[PDB]
Amino acid sequence: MLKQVEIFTDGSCLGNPGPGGYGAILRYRGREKTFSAGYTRTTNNRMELMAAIVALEALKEACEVILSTDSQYVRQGITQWIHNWKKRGWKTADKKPVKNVDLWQRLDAALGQHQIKWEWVKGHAGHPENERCDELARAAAMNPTLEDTGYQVEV
């Protein structure tokens, strides 16, 4: 039994927008849960965000998490933008709503409950679990069954 919840995520997309999917591996309690879904029209960034949200939302109590992803958008958001956006009421300098505010606000809520250690992997050097995420994410996008509701060409 791991003394820390381990989370691995990836997302993929064939176009901008296009069909896309996500893969998330969660090691919680004594099992290994795998999540993966495809969406009809979405973006890469949205899928990488969706990876992390679905895994964290599966966490029913406050936990000590370690999340590993090679995603630069999650990283960039988490390390340099997020802190700034709350202070600005989730707006851009031009007073418009941030892009993917629906996903960022949603992930924000999910982290609020936990102790999190972020591990930024290099695409070419993740653990066997990040690669499986890549493969799940890819397969999902090849067979999309869901609609990405917050997507806009727009805002």
What does this protein structure show overall?
Monomer. It catalyses: Endonucleolytic cleavage to 5'-phosphomonoester. Pfam families: RNase_H. It is found in: Cytoplasm. The termini are far apart. A 5-stranded mixed β-sheet has the order 3-2-1-4-5. The longest helix has 16 residues, at 72-87. The chain is 35% helix and 28% strand. By secondary structure, the chain is an alpha/beta fold. It has one domain: Ribonuclease H-like superfamily/Ribonuclease H (Nucleotidyltransferase, domain 5, 2-Layer Sandwich).
Kindly list the characteristics that best describe this protein:
155 residues, alpha/beta, Nucleotidyltransferase, domain 5, 5-stranded mixed β-sheet, 4 helices, globular, nuclease
Walk me through the topology.
Blueprint: E1 5-13, E2 18-28, E3 31-42, H1 44-56, E4 64-69, H2 72-87, H3 101-111, E5 115-120, H4 128-141
Parallel strand pairs: 1-4, 4-5
Antiparallel strand pairs: 1-2, 2-3
Helix pairs in contact: 1-3
What strand line-up does the widest sheet have? 3-2-1-4-5
Annotated CATH architecture: 2-Layer Sandwich
The biggest beta sheet reads:
5 strands, mixed
Count of all domains: 1
Work out the radius of gyration.
15 Å
- How many runs of DSSP E, i.e. beta strands? 5
Query: CATH superfamily name?
Result: Ribonuclease H-like superfamily/Ribonuclease H
Q: Helices and strands, in N-to-C order?
A: EEEHEHHEH
The separation of the N and C termini measures 44 Å
Structural class: alpha/beta
Number of contiguous helices: 4
Query: Globular, elongated, flat, extended or rod-shaped: what is the shape?
Result: globular
Q: Indicate the proportion of strand residues.
A: 25-35%
What CATH calls the topology is: Nucleotidyltransferase, domain 5
- At the first level of CATH, what is the class? Alpha Beta
Helix content: 25-40%
PDB class: hydrolase(endoribonuclease)
Keywords: hydrolase(endoribonuclease)
Assembly: monomeric
Entry title: structural study of mutants of escherichia coli ribonuclease HI with enhanced thermostability
